[PDB]
Specification:
Order of helices and strands: EHEHHEEHEHHEHEHEHEHHHEHEEEEH
Shape: globular
Number of domains: 2
Distance between the termini: 40 Å
Keywords: ABC transporter permease, Structural Genomics, mcsg, alpha/beta fold, solute, transport protein
Name: Putative branched-chain amino acid ABC transporter, periplasmic branched-chain amino acid-binding protein
Entry title: The crystal structure of abc transporter permease from pseudomonas fluorescens group
Assembly: monomeric
Structural class: alpha/beta
PDB class: transport protein
Number of strands: 14
Length: about 425
């Protein structure tokens, strides 16, 4: 058991979000199962995992972290994924003290992109800052070039929360550069009522709506848009508004709806067929219902698990075929270099983007794909759209420095 590498799993199987959550965990588990049985673990090192119920709350999330941070029956922790924004936010400072890398895929502190200020916090693959850039870059691709953005209107309809306000900075910057009208429209919690917002949108008739709602406000946004006659295929959802469950309640009013994703739905990727061949057909897999096997939730589990696995694998290249430290796990993360060649090997070519992290860059990705909803299924309608991360970097540097000043931290020198 100490000979194995511990993979802590902070999961929720109770409450309103259990239905979606179980699809995510099943993705992580099946991929972990696959690595053990088909590749004999990671370079010979077997993987052991255990679940702790977090009930989607920060209070229990924190208790799970404290239960796991020391390992399981000897097996140490290399990386930790709280799977929860409130838990992740609360854990950041004590994770640094314990030298345990926090991974938040597509969420978390955007300023933690700067690993000189956030040594053990990794908002991997896509931050909301980068998402803004990719959103704009896709618009530009659709309008015929960045020149065409001048004279365009882009409205952002956002849940009034830290999550919704995150894109205020980058969208303002991008609007100054490319000259599109930057319309920012808040939606108060819970967001059951949106008539004023969509009345405004019909009046202003923007060319695109960047939909950054969450939970209940997302199907309502779509339903209301159709009511006010705004064309739904001019609406592009946040990655956290890109699920079937986000749009199914809206019924046929959601036909044509666009959404961004770092892990597109689909059960026809290379890795997915290996899963069917090995754990699905053999009835080994955690998923109760096979009907969600390419669901976006399931695929986030696959990508979430693969990132950690590659990080571990990367670090073994300097620490040998053995269970790893969080301090070593941090080294692996910061040296992640996922190629297209590498993606082809593990079969994540269409599913996961390239990753190149550094001490300076704990994001390492910044791309997304666009998929379209027809009322029943998603359809990929774009390649990977890369963000202009160089353009946004001063905002990140500024934000991380303010934090380092406030918390009185000495930034790591990676020069």
């Amino acid at each position: 058991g100490p000979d194995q590498q511990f993979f802590p799993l902070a999961t929720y199987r109770v409450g309103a979000y259990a239905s979606s959550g179980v699809q995510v965990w099943a993705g992580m588990i099946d991929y972990l199962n696959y690595i053990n049985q088909v590749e004999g673990g990671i370079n010979g090192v077997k993987l052991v995992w255990q679940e702790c119920e977090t009930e989607w709350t920060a209070e229990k999330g924190i208790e799970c972290y404290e239960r796991f941070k020391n390992g399981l029956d000897g097996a140490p922790v290399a990386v930790y994924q709280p799977n929860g924004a409130p838990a992740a936010y609360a854990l950041s400072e004590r994770a640094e003290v314990d030298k345990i890398p926090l991974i938040t895929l597509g969420y978390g502190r955007t300023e933690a992109t700067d690993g000189t200020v956030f040594p053990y916090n990794f908002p991997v693959m896509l931050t909301f800052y980068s998402e803004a850039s990719t959103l704009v870059n896709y618009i530009a691709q659709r309008e015929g070039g960045f020149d065409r953005l001048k004279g365009k209107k882009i409205a952002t309809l956002y849940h009034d929360s830290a999550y919704g306000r995150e894109t205020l900075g980058p969208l303002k910057l991008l609007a100054e550069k490319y000259g599109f009208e930057n319309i920012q429209i808040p939606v108060a919690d819970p967001g059951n009522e949106q008539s004023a917002q969509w009345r405004q949108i019909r009046q202003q008739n923007p060319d695109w709506v960047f939909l950054r709602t969450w939970g209940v406000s997302t199907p309502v946004a779509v339903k209301t848009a159709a009511r006010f006659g705004f064309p739904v295929d001019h609406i592009i959802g946040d990655i956290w508004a890109s699920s079937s469950e986000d749009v199914l309640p809206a019924g046929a009013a959601a036909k044509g709806y666009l959404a961004l994703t770092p892990y597109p739905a689909g059960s026809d990727f290379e890795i997915h067929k290996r899963l069917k061949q090995y754990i699905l057909d053999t009835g080994k897999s955690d998923l109760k219902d096979l009907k969600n096997f390419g669901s976006v939730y399931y695929n986030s589990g696959l990508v979430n698990a693969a990132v950690a696995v590659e990080a571990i694998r990367t670090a073994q290249g300097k620490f040998g075929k053995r269970p790893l430290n969080g301090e070593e796990g941090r080294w692996g993360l910061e040296h992640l270099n996922i190629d297209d060649a590498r993606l082809k090997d593990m079969g994540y070519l269409g599913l996961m983007q390239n990753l190149k992290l550094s001490c300076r860059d704990h994001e390492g990705g910044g791309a997304a794909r666009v998929q379209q909803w027809d009322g029943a299924n998603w359809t990929l309608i774009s390649e990977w759209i890369a963000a202009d991360r160089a353009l946004l970097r001063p905002l990140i540097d500024e934000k991380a420095a303010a934090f380092a000043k406030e918390k009185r931290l000495v930034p790591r020198t990676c020069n």
